[model samples]
Target: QPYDDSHCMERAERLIGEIKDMFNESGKFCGENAFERLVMVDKVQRLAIDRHFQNEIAQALDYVYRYWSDCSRDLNSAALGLRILRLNRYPVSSDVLRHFKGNDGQFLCPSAQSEEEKIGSILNLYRASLIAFPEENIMDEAKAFATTYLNQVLQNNNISSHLSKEIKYNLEYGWHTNLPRVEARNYMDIYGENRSWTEMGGNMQILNLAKLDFNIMQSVHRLELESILKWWKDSNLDKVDFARHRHVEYFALACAYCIDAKYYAYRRDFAKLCALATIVDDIYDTYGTIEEIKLFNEAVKMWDSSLPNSLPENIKIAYKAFHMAVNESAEAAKKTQGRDILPYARKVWEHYLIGLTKEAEWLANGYIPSLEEYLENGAPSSGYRVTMLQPTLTLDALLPDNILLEMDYPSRFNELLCLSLRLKGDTRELVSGISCYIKDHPGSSEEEALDYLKDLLQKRLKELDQEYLKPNNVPAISKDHAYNIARSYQLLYKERDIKDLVTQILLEPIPL
Candidate 1:
């Protein structure tokens, strides 16, 4: 970690400067090659550095969108344009899909399938189709057919190994569920190999920067993990029955979601809180009896230290540790941010305890609630909602408390996030949501439940994408953090436990 030469950072900064020059020079109609220039914009975007070229990227997309009719001639072009337009809130109608499909309502593919280029276009279409909301029947149909074709191509080994990996990863982590950094890191592998990219020193430089930056940030992540692992060790959770010490999973959660070096505190806080949540969850689910668990749940809302004797020692330790963690956050923020902040911190925990109790009561009473009722209780049970505590409240991101409390976006965002993890966990092997769904929903066949669960997860994510994209009162950075939290939860849910592999993936630097 200490063998530090910042040559990569220096080179990346220089490359970034050259990139800005290109953006300024490559104005619309700078040459007649506007479409080709637009491709460069998309290239920059896929690498996740659009934050450095906002005007260029936006103007390029605008220029490209201006020629929407021409762009829709090809399947990949149309899909790319639609994805860009919709993400920027242009609301392009899906009539283009009508052109592709014709009036028969039958989906169509390329004239040729043996060509890798054709298969590649189909793959992009599949990724683009998934961003559709519930209403766009055209997009929905496109998605279903695109997925079918994409899978078929995959099954017959009809593509190159590179293309094969792309399809598999795309399906495994859909467009909406993916972390931007992770996505960009993966893309840099292929993006830099093309002639256009290799000719530009800046492209390679940014790639170099990405590599060093990723490793640099990773060192920080390891530091946080070290701190977290210490807590895991000192907590003696490994020796304690029913209190799973999920250090690796927590590390993955922080690495994938809160990867930036600036989020060092957040990474540590989130990982520790999640580890504590695991302890608390097991206490309620497996360790404590109905009566004792109920009393322990009551202890959280009670907010007093005259603790119950009926609680298990592990539950007692869990409660104190959780309580102290929450208070310490508020206390630290109070010193630095000049507000008590205790109320908001306490509010996050209260939601968790209540959600947990709601589920525990279902178990206690032999009750199975409707899908609506179960999802309502599921969010807070997994500590999904708690991820918001730091960004929404602690940071002087300066979002008003009123906005935070508003039913408009924050509350809705919370609900969407809650379901993002809870419902999706049901699709996976859920320790957090349902028994991955079919086991809980025996009325349906396994395949039926799998389809239903996948559809349900996709739709909620669809809605969240729409919600986060709009012009809203939330600051862009805060909104970004909120979305990051959602993505992190999805990753954890998708891989139920032992998330060390994700950290290993994170360790695989973007270029280095």
Candidate 2:
């Protein structure tokens, strides 16, 4: 089944044992130049095999941090080190990048004569710029220089196809928004050219490991997808005519959020939450009358079945699915986490239902809230909170006591994430932050309002980055969960052909 993962698993274990011997405590190739060390770290991560070498990576970064000052002499090393260090929560400064600038305050072109080295240097710099925090204007400048150079290179007809593909991917997806599996698949394709990773002294052993790892994970994801499809059919959510049938896309989004094999149950559960939310959202937005929606909302709030028979059949089926799936997850969480997390789960659903109801009231009453007012409700109403809650509780390390209590309501990070999902694109119709802003500020063009919303989205992302980096009592897994969820939306909002991506990631195995 699914291309016989049994043989692949055996080959992968043999390769893993061989590769493990390559690293000492200080990580593979400790005495190499900083550029070599940094590139190795980046490649391992992009290949999606870093999960196999967490300790080795940590030691490598620790070793790299010792010579952080020395790496600034080389463009590729400096840029790559900055990105890898910041991502690992190491204390490094962006100001060190000033070394690469000349008197004109632009990044100096790389000293290498070969086009490949020159292009790779600028591309790594472009990637480093993506993780910039607020007011790090140097990163903004670096991005401009690198982007202009790469675009001009693309205009030339002689560039290698692999290089062109790599540049395009880095420019489009960036590190902040690209999901791990997507990045891994794309990089594996590029790695096969034997020109990119091998340039850094990489061997066939690591390449074999990456390919086998991907094929094995694809089978795991495919099985999970099948289970989700069966659940969707059994729940009868597909019968709702007005609702968007997106169980496949939702399952893809689940894999995007977290791709490790251990999160199988959480991914399936997360997919169902997305499916259930979409059905209910459509019922509120399209099908239900004000009275009908109110009745349905109360039914969800009370978790009751004794309602008027006049309630629509579609709405009843949607609720039944939500009720059954949520209870099952609560029971699983109790068994796993050793605590009854049903109350927390219930509160999350109730708040979400109230947010949806408030939006309905606004539409019925012709109420255009102020921009600030709209965001408060819009963020939670975006339905991201419900999708994220149970998975974070069940899969991540236990939340600290004070932090756990604080999570009874959305925290600042959650609110920013809500805005990220809501203001991501012009996806909403009846009421949006853009419409509300234009209403609040008369004489502003729709274009102007949209620009303003985009700026707010950028600022929100910066705040989220700061939150992720800030030292806090919150578990790092929970923080990564929040950050990665935002990253998933960046893909969700823009990619119209996500189904193709799902097939490539979940269904097709990489050819060795």
Candidate 3:
């Protein structure tokens, strides 16, 4: 049997109660907690809130749909009633469909059997219009209704006084309304003329028409961007924004540029397309420091020198590893291709490495910088900062156990440790811990940490799969989802510290 409104309502109520109880309990424990503990509590609370809202929204939609379904039997009321149902399905705009063809081609409601039925039909049409129309349009309709209902009140000379007083008070201390002094003067001017009802109504209509145009433009832009992004993703191009401290609005603009470039490419405008790519590359490289460019250049040189012919066996293996790393990095770069701005971020990285190799040769030739050079000399700001040196201890120095266990602690110990490391604004603790762990564990290396994280993420994915696929036991979720989520969290750990360090580093004065 299909569950009815009552069943859904009851389930929603129960879920809300559970959420409230959990939130209240968690709120008390968060006050005196550490940053890590607070973060975990915040995550739990957000999850509960999401579930609560989902239940409420689902119940409301179901109830609304059911109401429409029942009223559909009456031909006179059906069209108007079902309009509300259709509005919910596509909440973007009432005019999303250029023309409305009610159930049939009927302009008005069908004949009703009784006065009550007639009234019900009228009420249904009004309600459906309210749902289908935009909020501003509804507000205009409301003002019209008020004007018709209170015609006498509106015409009274005392009404002007009341409106003036209200405006004065609002100008002095209104919370949200920005009633400018000029608006007050305009109101006074309108009252001075003793305008006819039609004139007053015309003013309001004009205001609403202007607002409607603005709203339409906003809606169109939103839809256009969404469509472009969807097309890019559908085309299997990878596009992403990785700059942490930058404005996302700029990122969106960048995405739009890439999308435009793709469109031009489709039209065979190769020169213009490359020009856009260069623009994107410039934006990306501008964010990195000269030092980053130097390191990249060195890496490139290493890569070029170590290729097939010029190396010993040991060097050959190192070169192979370098090549694999470069390929993986390129793959990461490919994910950000979209209809938006061409991200020449990879090319920027390549150029940076090339620059670094040139700088290294200059250093090797014993060239000393002039006093002006000292004035201009600065440390590299981009790329990962290696703050700690390698320790003398080997993997055999610390641990007797050959096995490494990956466990999910009830407490977010790892998150807390990460937060603490970030708060210190350095990578010393991170590098040190890995060094110590590997030294003691024997045979364990930096790769072991990555492996452990991957294992934990797999375990999490399996747990989620079990929960979601419960009775059917169908495995629909991807492992990549789990891996990405895990990586995001791990990246967050590094970002918090990196951001702080970058801020401090950039703000430091250069020695003359």
User: Residues 1-512, candidate 2, lDDT per residue (tens digit)?
Assistant: 66654888989988877765665532544364655566667777888788887876787788788878876677778888988898888878788788887665567656654888888889888988888888888988898888888998888848888888888888888865678878888888777775645564445777878889988888889988888888878878778666665777777766754768887767877778877887878888878888878887778778774456767778778878888888877776776667888877888888888889888888988888898888888877888888878767767477644686444245777777777888885432657787888898999998899888888887778777766677667777677776777777778766867777778777878899
- Ranking of predictions according to TM-score: 2, 1, 3
Preferred candidate (TM-score higher): 1 or 2 = 2
Off by over 4 Å in 2: 1-5, 25-34, 103-105, 199-201, 305-308, 405-408, 427-430
Measured by TM-score, how close is model 3 to the native structure?
0.21
Candidate 1's residue-wise lDDT over 167-271, tens digit each? 777777776566766676666666554545567654665565455555656666766677777766665555566666565665665565455565566666666
**What is the clash count for each candidate, in the order shown?**
1, 0, 27
Q: Say which candidate scores most in TM-score.
A: 2
**1 or 3, which is superior by TM-score?**
1
Per-residue CA lDDT of model 3 for 84-198, tens digit only, reads: 3342242223332213234322223345445334433433333333322223343234223323323333344344543434333323322111112112223333333344522
TM-score of every candidate relative to the true structure: 0.82, 0.94, 0.21
Question: Alpha carbon lDDT of residue 296, candidate 3?
Answer: 33
lDDT of each: 0.66, 0.77, 0.30
Residue 65 lDDT, candidate 1, scale 0-100 = 78
